[PDB]
Amino acid sequence: MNSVKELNVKEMKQLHGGVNYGNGVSCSKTKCSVNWGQAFQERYTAGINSFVSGVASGAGSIGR
Numbered sequence: 001m002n003s004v005k006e007l008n009v010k011e012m013k014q015l016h017g018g019v020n021y022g023n024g025v026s027c028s029k030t031k032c033s034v035n036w037g038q039a040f041q042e043r044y045t046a047g048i049n050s051f052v053s054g055v056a057s058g059a060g061s062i063g064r
Contacts, residue, residue: 026032054061
């Protein structure tokens with residue numbers, strides 16, 4: 001797929017760079033606290049959402 005909209009996402013993806021287990025952060029220029037609770041429930045909602053369609057609300061996975 002030589003798409004520009006599809007390649008646009010992949011590009012920016014490995015463009016900004018990448019992380020490798022950045023759980024050991026410290027206080028520098030900004031607060032040294034993480035929201036692994038509130039947004040924890042956030043990813044849970046966004047995750048199941050994509051899962052639904054992929055299967056149900058999507059009907060375009062062709063994965064038997």
